């Protein structure tokens, strides 16, 4: 699925933030945003939100 790919991307970011590079780019909704290690916690919560969304077969709207 597409979300599966968007996950490997935000993940490749956790590796780019622990290697020293503080600024990182992320494609979200066709819109780019630059988070710095200053807010690496929100990235941890966002990822988790995807593991819960890939649980149910979506079914339909919320």
Half-sphere exposure of 56 (CA within 13 A, CB side): 7
Q: Which experimental approach was used here?
A: NMR
The number of C-alpha atoms within 13 Å of 25 and in the hemisphere containing its C-beta is 4
Give residue for tokens 């020293």. 20
- The residue behind tokens 């503080």 is 22
Residue 11: both structure tokens together? 């993940």
Sign, CA dihedral 53-54-55-59, equals positive
Domain parsing of the chain, residue ranges: 1-62
Q: Quickly name the fold that domain 1-62 has.
A: Head-to-tail joining protein W, gpW (3.30.1580)
């Amino acid at each position: 699925m597409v979300r599966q790919e968007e996950l490997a991307a935000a993940r490749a970011a956790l590796h780019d933030l622990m290697t020293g590079k503080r600024v990182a780019t992320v494609q979200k909704d066709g819109r780019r945003v630059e988070f710095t290690a200053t807010s690496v916690s929100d990235l941890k919560k966002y990822i988790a939100e995807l593991e819960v969304q890939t649980g149910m077969t979506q079914r339909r709207r919320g």
